[PDB]
Amino acid sequence: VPGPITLIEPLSGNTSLLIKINAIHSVKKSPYQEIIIADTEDYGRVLILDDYIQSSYVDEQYYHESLVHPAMATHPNPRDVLILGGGEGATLREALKHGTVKRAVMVDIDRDVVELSRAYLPQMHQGAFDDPRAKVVIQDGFVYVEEAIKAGDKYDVIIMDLTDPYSSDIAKQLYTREFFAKIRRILNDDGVVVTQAGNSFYFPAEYDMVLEGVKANFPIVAEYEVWIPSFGYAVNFILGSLRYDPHALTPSEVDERLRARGVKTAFYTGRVHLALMNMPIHRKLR
Amino acid sequence: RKVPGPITLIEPLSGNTSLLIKINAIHSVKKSPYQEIIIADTEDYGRVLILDDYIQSSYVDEQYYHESLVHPAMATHPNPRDVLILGGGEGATLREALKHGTVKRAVMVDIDRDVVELSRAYLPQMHQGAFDDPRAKVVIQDGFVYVEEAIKAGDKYDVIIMDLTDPYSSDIAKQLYTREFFAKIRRILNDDGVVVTQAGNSFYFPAEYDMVLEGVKANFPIVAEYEVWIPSFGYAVNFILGSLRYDPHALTPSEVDERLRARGVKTAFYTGRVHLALMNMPIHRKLR
Amino acid sequence: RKVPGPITLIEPLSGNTSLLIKINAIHSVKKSPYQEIIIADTEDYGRVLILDDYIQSSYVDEQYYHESLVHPAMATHPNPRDVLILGGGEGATLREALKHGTVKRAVMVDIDRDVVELSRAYLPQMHQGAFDDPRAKVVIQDGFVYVEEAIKAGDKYDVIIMDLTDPYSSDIAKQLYTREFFAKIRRILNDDGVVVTQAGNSFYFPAEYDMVLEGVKANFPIVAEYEVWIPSFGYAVNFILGSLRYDPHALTPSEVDERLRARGVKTAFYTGRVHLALMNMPIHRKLR
Amino acid sequence: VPGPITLIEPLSGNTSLLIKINAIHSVKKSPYQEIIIADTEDYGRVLILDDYIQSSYVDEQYYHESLVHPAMATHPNPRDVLILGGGEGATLREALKHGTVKRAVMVDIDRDVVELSRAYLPQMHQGAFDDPRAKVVIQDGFVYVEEAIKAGDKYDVIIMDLTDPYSSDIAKQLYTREFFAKIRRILNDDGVVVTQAGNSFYFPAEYDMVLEGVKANFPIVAEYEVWIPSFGYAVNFILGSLRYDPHALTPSEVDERLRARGVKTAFYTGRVHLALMNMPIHRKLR
Numbered sequence A, D: 001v002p003g004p005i006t007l008i009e010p011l012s013g014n015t016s017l018l019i020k021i022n023a024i025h026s027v028k029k030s031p032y033q034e035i036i037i038a039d040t041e042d043y044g045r046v047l048i049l050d051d052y053i054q055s056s057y058v059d060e061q062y063y064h065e066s067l068v069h070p071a072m073a074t075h076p077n078p079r080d081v082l083i084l085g086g087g088e089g090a091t092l093r094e095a096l097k098h099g100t101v102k103r104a105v106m107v108d109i110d111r112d113v114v115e116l117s118r119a120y121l122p123q124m125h126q127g128a129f130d131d132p133r134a135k136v137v138i139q140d141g142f143v144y145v146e147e148a149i150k151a152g153d154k155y156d157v158i159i160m161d162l163t164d165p166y167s168s169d170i171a172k173q174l175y176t177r178e179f180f181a182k183i184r185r186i187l188n189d190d191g192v193v194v195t196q197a198g199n200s201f202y203f204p205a206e207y208d209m210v211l212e213g214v215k216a217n218f219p220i221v222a223e224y225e226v227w228i229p230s231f232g233y234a235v236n237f238i239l240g241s242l243r244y245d246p247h248a249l250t251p252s253e254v255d256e257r258l259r260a261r262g263v264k265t266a267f268y269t270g271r272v273h274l275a276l277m278n279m280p281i282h283r284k285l286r
Numbered sequence B, C: 001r002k003v004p005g006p007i008t009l010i011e012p013l014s015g016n017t018s019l020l021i022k023i024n025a026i027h028s029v030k031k032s033p034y035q036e037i038i039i040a041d042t043e044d045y046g047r048v049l050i051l052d053d054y055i056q057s058s059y060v061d062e063q064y065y066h067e068s069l070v071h072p073a074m075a076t077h078p079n080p081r082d083v084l085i086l087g088g089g090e091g092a093t094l095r096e097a098l099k100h101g102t103v104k105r106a107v108m109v110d111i112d113r114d115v116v117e118l119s120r121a122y123l124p125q126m127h128q129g130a131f132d133d134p135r136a137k138v139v140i141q142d143g144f145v146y147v148e149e150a151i152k153a154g155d156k157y158d159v160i161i162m163d164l165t166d167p168y169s170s171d172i173a174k175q176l177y178t179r180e181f182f183a184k185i186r187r188i189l190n191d192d193g194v195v196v197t198q199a200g201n202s203f204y205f206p207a208e209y210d211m212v213l214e215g216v217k218a219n220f221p222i223v224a225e226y227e228v229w230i231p232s233f234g235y236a237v238n239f240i241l242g243s244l245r246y247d248p249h250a251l252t253p254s255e256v257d258e259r260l261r262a263r264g265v266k267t268a269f270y271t272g273r274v275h276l277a278l279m280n281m282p283i284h285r286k287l288r
């Protein structure tokens, strides 16, 4: 039974997790959110924002590989990547593994998250912030996208790695139908977007809202989920595509693209892709 | 609500993580000779059965568990006529197995009369009358003793489903998870038979998981491992399917759907595509 | 057992501290128009009444609360004949007041019919038949409205006991804790009357405590502050006694005991020596 | 509602406290017990041993003044004081306030507690460890008392400030009938002993055992309790005396002795003494 020091992680409002804490490395009230970096017995080091674990050493690769690789592998040649959120740098780490990437931009609203990750989460970023192909921008992603439309910027793959649509004030504007219309305006004609969408089991209304938003703007939409122990649930992802269909990729094609591009993974493979594409998402059944 | 309440179940998960679950009502508390039983209503999961603090089953998500436990095995077997279930006290496992039109005889063996009785009374959406199907026999006995007696009698089954309390926590079930017990299971299977068991959780309890896996592998030439997230448990349950002849990996979605249709099996979750996903998704392990 | 369970009440205490209390059974859950009511059995405290997550009363320790609330005031008054109780939904306050042989009329006013009804049914050791004493009248009404109507009618009482939900948490009771309300209380007291109220907790909620204290002091020349540890609440409840003539500080143990004897008052806790202790023990404050 | 980081403090087994933690200053697994020093929102800095708060900045004075002053004030001239336990040094701090004290010995089994208190709990010891009248001995108090009998050592006042009789393995031998017989052998003829005895409400059996032990060995016994918010209960104290009766002290006599000896307190006064002597201890009433 966990203790004596414990994190109470909110899950649904009607369920929470109690997680044994071994140490607290940092506590910072930023202008945007409360940040904690801590060591947990079960999950090793974690980043916590407003009481929610964002990432853990023992299971973050399940999250970041699931977020990034299906989209990157679906695109036959992703050269320009935009990441909204991803403050710990693991999303950037995964995207930069694709040898085809020439430019990766990461936009986070909160300098404190990026700085504390640089210092305390080395196994997450793994030097990605200093890759010559990477640019880290501190800005509200809403404003950044407006400015990119004005400039006529274009990306192959846009990855949204934000705080949750069911809980997060600072990210709420990025989950609307209107924002996805803007995302489409900064994609190439064969581009792909992927976002995490919370959890369809515990937060179906918020999930459905994000889904409707993506569907209104993209002809091809894939929904898939992965269990992340440290979150207490299976995260839902939504992949929106303008041309290429993730459902049409075979295990062999996935593995060949990963190999050709020099992508090493702890989890994601062609067989995983097939499973993600075929497993329906969880809903309350009664 | 950061802390669910005011009335809360503290469900152990790993020892280093637990779940706090809002309770709306308690319908029954019974200290049986074997274990502490609670039936309660939860806000998130509806009605639950709890044994020794662990949720065994919930109204909102039990179909994910019982369909995942039962159908891959039953669908792998081309003609399962005789089914044995060890555990399954709430009757949902029996419910799922009886859906296969080919089944002529289903035996369910649970050590604890109180679980079966309280389920009859309080969990109608789980058993759905399965206890009273003319094809079904409910036996109250330790499954270890029952299997020894079946060897003596020379009993044989097509499909054996083990739906017990967890291998990492449950004293009453520990003997049923050994290499030696799986040798006994093999002795009461037909030559083309299949066994399936839940094996706890490979992420939080890898040692206990590996022990069950080694046990199955020592006794069965074909072994499939698959997992499914069950919200009310707080983790993805691991299942281990052991087969003497037929390979679940060889089934196509179309073949699965055709067998389900032919046998009159209606499901809320399991389909040919789900089968494919289960067969191709690797199980979770701590990665660092 | 580091974590009490499996079923647990999470009782808020300060916001920065809460109590986790093992629950054995839930006898009733009722969402009334005013508040959420639970009656439950706890391992440590026996049966409890819970309103909006806060234990109001427990079988094992309620006598410490009700005797401390009622008897100092009743014993201070040389001849209390007419008693008004605001709140006191479980009937234990009424029980204690009626023990004084001098009492001819006791009125108990609670806003919430559901509390009184569920107490009648499930908390017999609290009311102990007090609701049906010929000297007692139970009125269902907001205490604010009742006091306004009593002013209009020119009603007068010897002792007014306020036994409400907390001043730091309770919306329904907030109007009864103001300077202005205590001015109204004074208008329905005889010239030598006394009021007593619980005032939350001066350690965890000093601001709310000080506000109630200032309110009483503005209206009453004699004010005594005392506290008693109530295990089931997680803190020492603060009481404030306001008096128009008679000083509780002037009572000797022997005089208290003589008045209790003369009036036929039997207690489990309160005595003359307890009175002396209550009058001399300073209340708790955060010291750093 | 407390969080996100929380201490789960055991109370009875059937009740525990959840306490918001702001920071952890130190975690040490000593040979004897697990030690944590932390900042709590409600109670400020705390020392925790095996999950139980031993002392908090906001309420420790209620505990230490209640433990020390009734006994010291009962004795007309306490010159030699022995303290068993008291690892944070607050007991020593309170005892040294009496101008009559010439020698105060503090005996704790655990060097780590004393060291971590020196470093992290300055408001508790307040330099008491380095008072010329003080001697700090690291030793099991059972062994120390046996050695004192052999040497024929004598004290005026013995204060036992140990971990709880209902939970603590390392202290169990010091709470027996036989140990109180030994305590009597190292007291002068007019000496006094005082000990905390856990809690008579939640742990009546353990309480009664300590009480029976004291009663078998001392003709005058006083029982009193004080609510300590950070513990979640009213601590019970038991004062054993060979000659002088704490019940016979008037408030004025208490105040005169405090004044004469130069004792300044935040809580204890003559009126408090009278209250402590007259308030019965709590028991489950049903």
Ligand SMILES: CSC[C@H]1O[C@@H](n2cnc3c(N)ncnc32)[C@H](O)[C@@H]1O
Pocket (backbone or CB within 6 Å): A032, A047, A049, A054, A084, A085, A086, A087, A088, A107, A108, A109, A110, A113, A139, A140, A141, A142, A161, A162, A163, A170, A171, A172, A174
């Ligand atoms: C830790 S990964 C999630 C990241 O998303 C960031 N985030 C939240 N809202 C926004 C926004 N509107 N624009 C950019 N980044 C955001 C948070 O600061 C966090 O670092």
Ligand SMILES: CSC[C@H]1O[C@@H](n2cnc3c(N)ncnc32)[C@H](O)[C@@H]1O
Pocket (backbone or CB within 6 Å): B051, B056, B086, B087, B088, B089, B090, B109, B110, B111, B112, B115, B141, B142, B143, B144, B163, B164, B165, B172, B173, B176
């Ligand atoms: C609720 S489904 C799990 C069931 O397994 C049952 N069980 C546990 N151990 C054994 C055993 N050795 N034999 C049969 N049933 C068991 C428990 O009684 C429970 O009903």
Ligand SMILES: CSC[C@H]1O[C@@H](n2cnc3c(N)ncnc32)[C@H](O)[C@@H]1O
Pocket (backbone or CB within 6 Å): C034, C049, C051, C056, C086, C087, C088, C089, C090, C109, C110, C111, C112, C115, C141, C142, C143, C144, C163, C164, C165, C172, C173, C176
């Ligand atoms: C449990 S005893 C405390 C009682 O105070 C009652 N109460 C709260 N606010 C008011 C009010 N304004 N008037 C009368 N009773 C009240 C609650 O219904 C509860 O029964």
Ligand SMILES: CSC[C@H]1O[C@@H](n2cnc3c(N)ncnc32)[C@H](O)[C@@H]1O
Pocket (backbone or CB within 6 Å): D032, D047, D054, D084, D085, D086, D087, D088, D107, D108, D109, D110, D113, D139, D140, D141, D142, D161, D162, D163, D170, D171, D172, D174
């Ligand atoms: C913090 S005050 C309580 C102290 O009692 C000390 N203690 C516990 N058992 C013994 C013992 N047998 N002898 C001396 N000190 C002890 C502990 O190390 C702790 O520091």
